[PDB]
mmCIF file of C-alpha atoms and ligand atoms in Angstrom:
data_model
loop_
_atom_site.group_PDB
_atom_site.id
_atom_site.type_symbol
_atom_site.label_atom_id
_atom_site.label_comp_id
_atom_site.label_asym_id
_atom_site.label_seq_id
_atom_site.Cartn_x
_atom_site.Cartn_y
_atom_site.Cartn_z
ATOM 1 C CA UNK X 1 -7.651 -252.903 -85.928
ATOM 2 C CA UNK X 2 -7.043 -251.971 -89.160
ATOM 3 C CA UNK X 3 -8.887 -254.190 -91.914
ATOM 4 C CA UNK X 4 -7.011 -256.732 -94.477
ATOM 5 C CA UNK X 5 -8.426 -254.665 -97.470
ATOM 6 C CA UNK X 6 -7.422 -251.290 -96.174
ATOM 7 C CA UNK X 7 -3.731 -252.937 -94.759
ATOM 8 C CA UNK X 8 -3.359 -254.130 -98.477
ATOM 9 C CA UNK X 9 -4.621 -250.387 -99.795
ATOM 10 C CA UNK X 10 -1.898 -248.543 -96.849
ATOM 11 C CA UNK X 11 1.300 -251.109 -98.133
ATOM 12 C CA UNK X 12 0.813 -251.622 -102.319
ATOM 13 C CA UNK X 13 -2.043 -249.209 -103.341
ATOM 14 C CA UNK X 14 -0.718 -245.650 -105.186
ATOM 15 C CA UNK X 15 -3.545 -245.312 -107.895
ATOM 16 C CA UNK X 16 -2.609 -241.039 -107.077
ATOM 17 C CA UNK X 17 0.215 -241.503 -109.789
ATOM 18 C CA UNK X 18 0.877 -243.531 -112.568
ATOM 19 C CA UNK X 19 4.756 -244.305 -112.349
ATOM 20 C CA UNK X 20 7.580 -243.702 -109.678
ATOM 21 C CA UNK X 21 8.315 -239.756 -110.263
ATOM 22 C CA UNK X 22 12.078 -240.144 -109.517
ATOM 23 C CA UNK X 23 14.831 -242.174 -108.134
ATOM 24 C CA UNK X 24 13.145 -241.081 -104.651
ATOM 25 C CA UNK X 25 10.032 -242.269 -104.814
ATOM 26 C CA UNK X 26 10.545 -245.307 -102.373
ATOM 27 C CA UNK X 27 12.449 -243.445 -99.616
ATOM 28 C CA UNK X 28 8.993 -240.939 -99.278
ATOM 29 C CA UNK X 29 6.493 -243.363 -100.070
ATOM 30 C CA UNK X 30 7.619 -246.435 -97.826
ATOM 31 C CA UNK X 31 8.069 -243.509 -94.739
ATOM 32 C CA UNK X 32 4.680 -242.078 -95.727
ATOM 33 C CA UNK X 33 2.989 -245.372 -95.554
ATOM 34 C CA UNK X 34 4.446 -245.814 -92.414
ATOM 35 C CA UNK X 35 6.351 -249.185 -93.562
ATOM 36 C CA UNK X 36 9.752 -247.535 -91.854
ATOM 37 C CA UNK X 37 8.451 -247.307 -88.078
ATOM 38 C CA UNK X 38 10.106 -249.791 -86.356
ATOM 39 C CA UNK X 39 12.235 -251.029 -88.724
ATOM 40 C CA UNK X 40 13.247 -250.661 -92.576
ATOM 41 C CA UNK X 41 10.764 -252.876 -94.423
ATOM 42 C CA UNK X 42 12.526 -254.538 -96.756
ATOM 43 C CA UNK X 43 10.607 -255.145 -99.958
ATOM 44 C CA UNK X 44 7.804 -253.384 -100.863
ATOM 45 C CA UNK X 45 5.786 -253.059 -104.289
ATOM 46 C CA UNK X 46 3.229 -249.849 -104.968
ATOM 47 C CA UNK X 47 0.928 -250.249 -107.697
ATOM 48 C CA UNK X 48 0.047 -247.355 -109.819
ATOM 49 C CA UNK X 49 -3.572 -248.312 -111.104
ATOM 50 C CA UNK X 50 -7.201 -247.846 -109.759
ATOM 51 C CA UNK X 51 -8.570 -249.984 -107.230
ATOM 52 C CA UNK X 52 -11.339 -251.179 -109.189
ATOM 53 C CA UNK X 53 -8.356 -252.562 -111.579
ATOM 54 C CA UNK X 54 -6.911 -254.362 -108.923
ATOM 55 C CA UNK X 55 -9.783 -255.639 -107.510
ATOM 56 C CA UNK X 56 -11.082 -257.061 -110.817
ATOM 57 C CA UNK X 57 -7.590 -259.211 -110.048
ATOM 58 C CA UNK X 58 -9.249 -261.606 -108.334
ATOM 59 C CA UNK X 59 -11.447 -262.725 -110.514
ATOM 60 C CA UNK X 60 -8.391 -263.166 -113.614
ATOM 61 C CA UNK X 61 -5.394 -265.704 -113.561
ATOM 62 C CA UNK X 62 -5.965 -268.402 -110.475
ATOM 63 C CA UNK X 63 -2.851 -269.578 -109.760
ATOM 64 C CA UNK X 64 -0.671 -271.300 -106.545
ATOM 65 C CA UNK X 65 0.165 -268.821 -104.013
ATOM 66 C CA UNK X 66 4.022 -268.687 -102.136
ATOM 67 C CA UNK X 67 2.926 -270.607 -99.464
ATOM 68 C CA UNK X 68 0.687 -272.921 -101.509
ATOM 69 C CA UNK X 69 -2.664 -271.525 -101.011
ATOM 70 C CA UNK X 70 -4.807 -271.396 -103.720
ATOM 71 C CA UNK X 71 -6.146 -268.180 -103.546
ATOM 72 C CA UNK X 72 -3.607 -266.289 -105.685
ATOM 73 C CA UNK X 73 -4.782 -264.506 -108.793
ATOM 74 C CA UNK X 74 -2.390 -262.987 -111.409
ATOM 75 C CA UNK X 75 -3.396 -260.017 -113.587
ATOM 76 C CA UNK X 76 -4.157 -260.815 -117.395
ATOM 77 C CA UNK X 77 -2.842 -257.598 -118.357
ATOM 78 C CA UNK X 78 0.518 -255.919 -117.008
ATOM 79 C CA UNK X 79 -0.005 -252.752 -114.544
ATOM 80 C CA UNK X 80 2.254 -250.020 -113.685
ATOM 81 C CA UNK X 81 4.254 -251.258 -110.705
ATOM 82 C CA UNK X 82 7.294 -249.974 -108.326
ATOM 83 C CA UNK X 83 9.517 -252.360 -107.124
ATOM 84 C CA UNK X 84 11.477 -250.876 -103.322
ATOM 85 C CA UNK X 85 14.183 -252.947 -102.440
ATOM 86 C CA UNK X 86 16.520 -251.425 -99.255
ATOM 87 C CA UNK X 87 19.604 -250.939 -100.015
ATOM 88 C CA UNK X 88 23.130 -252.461 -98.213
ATOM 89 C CA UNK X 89 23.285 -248.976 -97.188
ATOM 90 C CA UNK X 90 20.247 -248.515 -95.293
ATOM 91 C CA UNK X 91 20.047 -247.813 -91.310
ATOM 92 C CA UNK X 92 17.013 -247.429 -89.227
ATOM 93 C CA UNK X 93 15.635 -244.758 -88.783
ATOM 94 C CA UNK X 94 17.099 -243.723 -92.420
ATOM 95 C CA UNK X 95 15.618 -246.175 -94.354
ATOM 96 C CA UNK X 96 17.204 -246.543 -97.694
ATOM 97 C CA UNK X 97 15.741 -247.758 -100.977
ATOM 98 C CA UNK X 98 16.261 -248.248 -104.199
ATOM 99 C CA UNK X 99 13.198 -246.935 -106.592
ATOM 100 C CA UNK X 100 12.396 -249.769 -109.545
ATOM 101 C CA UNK X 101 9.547 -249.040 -112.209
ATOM 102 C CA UNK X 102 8.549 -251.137 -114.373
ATOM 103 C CA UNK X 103 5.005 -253.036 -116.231
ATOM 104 C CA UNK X 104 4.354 -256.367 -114.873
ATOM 105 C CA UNK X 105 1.620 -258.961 -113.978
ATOM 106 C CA UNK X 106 0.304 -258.596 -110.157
ATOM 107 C CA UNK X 107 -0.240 -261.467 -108.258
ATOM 108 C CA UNK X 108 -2.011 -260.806 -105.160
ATOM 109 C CA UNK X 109 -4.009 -263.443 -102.733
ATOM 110 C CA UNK X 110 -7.706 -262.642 -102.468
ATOM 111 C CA UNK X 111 -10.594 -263.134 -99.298
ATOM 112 C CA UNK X 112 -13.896 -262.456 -98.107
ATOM 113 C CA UNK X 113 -16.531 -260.659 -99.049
ATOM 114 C CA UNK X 114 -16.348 -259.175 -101.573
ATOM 115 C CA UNK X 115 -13.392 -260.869 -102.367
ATOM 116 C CA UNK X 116 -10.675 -258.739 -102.628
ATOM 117 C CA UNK X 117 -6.917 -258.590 -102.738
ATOM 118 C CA UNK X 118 -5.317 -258.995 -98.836
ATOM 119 C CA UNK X 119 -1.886 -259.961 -100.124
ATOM 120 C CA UNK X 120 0.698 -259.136 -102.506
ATOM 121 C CA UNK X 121 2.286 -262.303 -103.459
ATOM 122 C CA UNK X 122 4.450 -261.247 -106.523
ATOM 123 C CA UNK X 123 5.287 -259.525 -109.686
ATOM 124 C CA UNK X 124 6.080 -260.786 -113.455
ATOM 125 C CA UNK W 1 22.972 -284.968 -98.555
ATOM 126 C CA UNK W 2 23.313 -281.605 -100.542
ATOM 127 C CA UNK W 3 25.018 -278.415 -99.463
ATOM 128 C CA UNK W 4 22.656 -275.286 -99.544
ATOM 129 C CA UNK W 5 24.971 -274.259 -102.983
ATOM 130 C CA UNK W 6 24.183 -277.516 -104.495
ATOM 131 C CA UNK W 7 20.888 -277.372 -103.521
ATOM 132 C CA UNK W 8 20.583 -273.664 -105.233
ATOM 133 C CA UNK W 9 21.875 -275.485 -108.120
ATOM 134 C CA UNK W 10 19.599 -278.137 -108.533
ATOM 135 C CA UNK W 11 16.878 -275.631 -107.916
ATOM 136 C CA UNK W 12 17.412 -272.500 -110.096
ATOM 137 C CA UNK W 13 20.209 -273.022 -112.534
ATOM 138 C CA UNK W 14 19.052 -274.163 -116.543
ATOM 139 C CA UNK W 15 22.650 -273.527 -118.091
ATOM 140 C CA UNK W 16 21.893 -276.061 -120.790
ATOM 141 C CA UNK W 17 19.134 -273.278 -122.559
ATOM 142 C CA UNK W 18 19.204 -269.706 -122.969
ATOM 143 C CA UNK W 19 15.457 -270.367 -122.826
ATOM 144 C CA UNK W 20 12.130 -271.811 -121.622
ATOM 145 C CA UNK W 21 11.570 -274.037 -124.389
ATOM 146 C CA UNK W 22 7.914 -273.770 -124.547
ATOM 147 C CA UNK W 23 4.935 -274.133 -122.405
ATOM 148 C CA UNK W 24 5.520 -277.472 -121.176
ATOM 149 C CA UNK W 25 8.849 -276.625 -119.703
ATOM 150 C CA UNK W 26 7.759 -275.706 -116.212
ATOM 151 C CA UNK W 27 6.381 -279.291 -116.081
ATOM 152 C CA UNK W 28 8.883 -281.068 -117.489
ATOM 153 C CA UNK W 29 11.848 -279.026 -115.302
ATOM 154 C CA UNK W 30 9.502 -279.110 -112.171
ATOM 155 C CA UNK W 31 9.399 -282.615 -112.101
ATOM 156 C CA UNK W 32 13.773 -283.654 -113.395
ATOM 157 C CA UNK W 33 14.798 -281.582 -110.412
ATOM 158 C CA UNK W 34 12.858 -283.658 -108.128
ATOM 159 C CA UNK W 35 10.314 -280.273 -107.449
ATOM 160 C CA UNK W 36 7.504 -282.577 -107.316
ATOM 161 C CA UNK W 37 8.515 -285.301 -105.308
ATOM 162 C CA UNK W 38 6.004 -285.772 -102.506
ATOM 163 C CA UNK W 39 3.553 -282.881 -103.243
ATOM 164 C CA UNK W 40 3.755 -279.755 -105.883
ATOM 165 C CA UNK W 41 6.255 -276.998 -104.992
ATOM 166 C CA UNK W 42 4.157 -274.090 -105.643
ATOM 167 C CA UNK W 43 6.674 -271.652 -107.201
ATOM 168 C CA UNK W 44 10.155 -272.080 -108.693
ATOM 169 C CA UNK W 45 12.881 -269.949 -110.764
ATOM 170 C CA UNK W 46 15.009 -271.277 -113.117
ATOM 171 C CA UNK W 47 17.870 -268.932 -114.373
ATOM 172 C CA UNK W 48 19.605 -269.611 -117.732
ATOM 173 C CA UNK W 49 22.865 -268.045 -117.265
ATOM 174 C CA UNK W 50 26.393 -269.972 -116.859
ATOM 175 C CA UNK W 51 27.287 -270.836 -113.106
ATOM 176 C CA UNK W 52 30.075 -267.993 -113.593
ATOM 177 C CA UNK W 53 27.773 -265.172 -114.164
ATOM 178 C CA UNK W 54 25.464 -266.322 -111.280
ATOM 179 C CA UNK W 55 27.476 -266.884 -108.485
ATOM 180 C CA UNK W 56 29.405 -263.124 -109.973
ATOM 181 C CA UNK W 57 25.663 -261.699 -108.235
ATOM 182 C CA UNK W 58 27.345 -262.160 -104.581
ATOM 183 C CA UNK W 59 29.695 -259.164 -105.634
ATOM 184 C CA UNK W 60 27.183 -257.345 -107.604
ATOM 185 C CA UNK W 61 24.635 -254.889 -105.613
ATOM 186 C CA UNK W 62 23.887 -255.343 -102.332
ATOM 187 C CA UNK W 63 20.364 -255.248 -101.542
ATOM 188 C CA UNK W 64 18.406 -256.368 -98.097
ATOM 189 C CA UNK W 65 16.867 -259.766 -99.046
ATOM 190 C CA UNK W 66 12.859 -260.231 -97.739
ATOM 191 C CA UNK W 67 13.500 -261.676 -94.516
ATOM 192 C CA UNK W 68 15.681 -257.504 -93.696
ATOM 193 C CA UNK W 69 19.322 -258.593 -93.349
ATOM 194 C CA UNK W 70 21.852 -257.723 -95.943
ATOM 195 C CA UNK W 71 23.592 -260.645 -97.651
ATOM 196 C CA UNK W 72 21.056 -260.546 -100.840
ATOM 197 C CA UNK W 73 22.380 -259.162 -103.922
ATOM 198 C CA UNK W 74 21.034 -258.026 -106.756
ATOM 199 C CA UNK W 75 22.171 -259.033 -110.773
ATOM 200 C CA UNK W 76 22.973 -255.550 -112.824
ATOM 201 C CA UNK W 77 22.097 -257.067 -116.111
ATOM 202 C CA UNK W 78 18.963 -258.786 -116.762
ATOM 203 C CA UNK W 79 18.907 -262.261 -116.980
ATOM 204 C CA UNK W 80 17.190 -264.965 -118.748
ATOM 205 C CA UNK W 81 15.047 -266.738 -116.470
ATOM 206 C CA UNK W 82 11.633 -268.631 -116.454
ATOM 207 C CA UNK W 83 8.917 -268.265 -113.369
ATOM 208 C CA UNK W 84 7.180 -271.563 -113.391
ATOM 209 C CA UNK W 85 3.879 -270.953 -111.089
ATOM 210 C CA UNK W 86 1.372 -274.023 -110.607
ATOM 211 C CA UNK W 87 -1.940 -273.775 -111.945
ATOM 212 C CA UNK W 88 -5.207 -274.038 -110.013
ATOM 213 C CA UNK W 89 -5.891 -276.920 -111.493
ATOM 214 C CA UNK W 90 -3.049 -278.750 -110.721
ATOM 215 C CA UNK W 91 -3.267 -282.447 -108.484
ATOM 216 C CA UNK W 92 -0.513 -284.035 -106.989
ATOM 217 C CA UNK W 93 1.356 -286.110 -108.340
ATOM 218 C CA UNK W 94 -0.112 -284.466 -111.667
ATOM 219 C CA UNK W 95 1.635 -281.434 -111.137
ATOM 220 C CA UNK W 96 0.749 -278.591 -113.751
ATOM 221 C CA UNK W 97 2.677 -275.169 -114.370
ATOM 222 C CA UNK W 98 2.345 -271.775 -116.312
ATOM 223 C CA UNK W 99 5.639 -271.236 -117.702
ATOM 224 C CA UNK W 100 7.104 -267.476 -118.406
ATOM 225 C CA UNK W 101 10.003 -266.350 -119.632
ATOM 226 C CA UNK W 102 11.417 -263.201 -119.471
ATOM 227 C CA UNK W 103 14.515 -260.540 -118.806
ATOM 228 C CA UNK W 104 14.996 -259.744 -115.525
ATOM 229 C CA UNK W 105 17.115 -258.653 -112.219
ATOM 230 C CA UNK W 106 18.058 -261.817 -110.112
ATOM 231 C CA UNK W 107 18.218 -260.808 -106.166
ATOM 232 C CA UNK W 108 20.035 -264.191 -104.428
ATOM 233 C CA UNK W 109 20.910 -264.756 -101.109
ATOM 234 C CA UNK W 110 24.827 -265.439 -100.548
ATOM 235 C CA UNK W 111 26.741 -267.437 -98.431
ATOM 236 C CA UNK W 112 30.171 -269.026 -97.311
ATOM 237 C CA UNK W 113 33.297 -268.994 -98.677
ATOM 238 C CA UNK W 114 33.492 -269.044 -101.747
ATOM 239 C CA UNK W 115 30.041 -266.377 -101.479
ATOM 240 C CA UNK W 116 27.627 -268.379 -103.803
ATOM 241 C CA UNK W 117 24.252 -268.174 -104.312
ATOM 242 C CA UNK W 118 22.146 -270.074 -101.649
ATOM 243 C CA UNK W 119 18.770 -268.725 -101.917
ATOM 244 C CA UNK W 120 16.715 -266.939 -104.989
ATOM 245 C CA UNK W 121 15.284 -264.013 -103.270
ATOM 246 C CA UNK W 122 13.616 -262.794 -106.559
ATOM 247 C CA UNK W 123 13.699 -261.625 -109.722
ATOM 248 C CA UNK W 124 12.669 -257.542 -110.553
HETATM 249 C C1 ADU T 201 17.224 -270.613 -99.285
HETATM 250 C C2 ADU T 201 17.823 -270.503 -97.883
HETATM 251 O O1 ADU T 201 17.632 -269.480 -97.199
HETATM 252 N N1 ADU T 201 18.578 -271.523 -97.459
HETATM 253 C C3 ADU T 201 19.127 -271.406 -96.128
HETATM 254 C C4 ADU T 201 18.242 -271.977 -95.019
HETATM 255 C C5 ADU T 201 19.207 -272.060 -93.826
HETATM 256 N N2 ADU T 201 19.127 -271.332 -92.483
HETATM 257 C C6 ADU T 201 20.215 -270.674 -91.838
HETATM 258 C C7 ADU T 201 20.086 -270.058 -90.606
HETATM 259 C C8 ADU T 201 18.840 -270.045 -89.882
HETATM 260 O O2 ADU T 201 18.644 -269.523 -88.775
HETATM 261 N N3 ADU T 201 17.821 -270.701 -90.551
HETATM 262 C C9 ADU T 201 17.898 -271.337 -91.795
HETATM 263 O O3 ADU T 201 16.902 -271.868 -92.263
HETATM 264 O O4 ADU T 201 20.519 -272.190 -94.401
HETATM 265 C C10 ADU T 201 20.470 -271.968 -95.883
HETATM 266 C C11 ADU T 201 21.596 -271.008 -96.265
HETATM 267 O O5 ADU T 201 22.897 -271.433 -95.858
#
């Protein structure tokens, strides 16, 4: 239904602000990216930069994805990233995280065309 | 025949170095903990931190690991560790990594009794 670019826009893409406001940033933005309904995603990471930015990411750093593809680029430059990890306290349908910010390299697995990011691999 | 602690061990722990050396660690480690064996383990963690303070994580702060349930935990200090990522131009049995080192949050999985460390989750 719903395209690989636009699923990867929806789960890590918040280029409307440039860091984490406060401590409840993950709790609103993993409900109103819909990553809380029908279960508590886990892990999730938002990145605060333009999509032109992170697009350009494919074309920087090729390195070894997770799973061994080779398809993963990582960022030159650090970007303004939040880290939401649930909490041991968390129950669906209340969803509990806790809010990280923090500057770090993006790695992200790229695809088609134009090749752009379809997977967020990891942070550094 | 290694137990998943010992294997968690082998894996992740650098005790012997409160550092990554320089930027031939990642191949030189990659290679003495048999992490490039039979074909070229993509990604890898190493933590330099005594066995003490690491398996102290698995009372630390509980966290929901990737795969959703609850036994991860994550580190409230930072800790030294080094990411060791292979590069895109890396050829088995030629392995080659990017080493970086850096100050972070260690999220492990835990398990048995004693509750050690049994799976690096990640680092934030
Ligand atoms: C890194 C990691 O997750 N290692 C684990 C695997 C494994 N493990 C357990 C239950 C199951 O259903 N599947 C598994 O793979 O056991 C190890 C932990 O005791």
């Amino acid at each position: 239904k719903e395209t690989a670019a636009a699923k990867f826009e929806r789960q890590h893409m918040d280029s409307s602000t440039s860091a984490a406001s406060s401590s409840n940033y993950c709790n609103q933005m993993m409900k109103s990216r819909n990553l809380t309904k029908d279960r508590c995603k886990p892990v999730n990471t938002f990145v605060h930069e333009s999509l032109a930015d992170v697009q350009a990411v494919c074309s920087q750093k090729n390195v070894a994805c997770k799973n061994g593809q080779t398809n993963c680029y990582q960022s030159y430059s650090t970007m303004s990233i939040t880290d939401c990890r649930e909490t041991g306290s968390s129950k669906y349908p209340n969803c509990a995280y806790k809010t990280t910010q923090a500057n770090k390299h993006i790695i992200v697995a790229c695809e088609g065309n134009p090749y752009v990011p379809v997977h967020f691999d990891a942070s550094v």
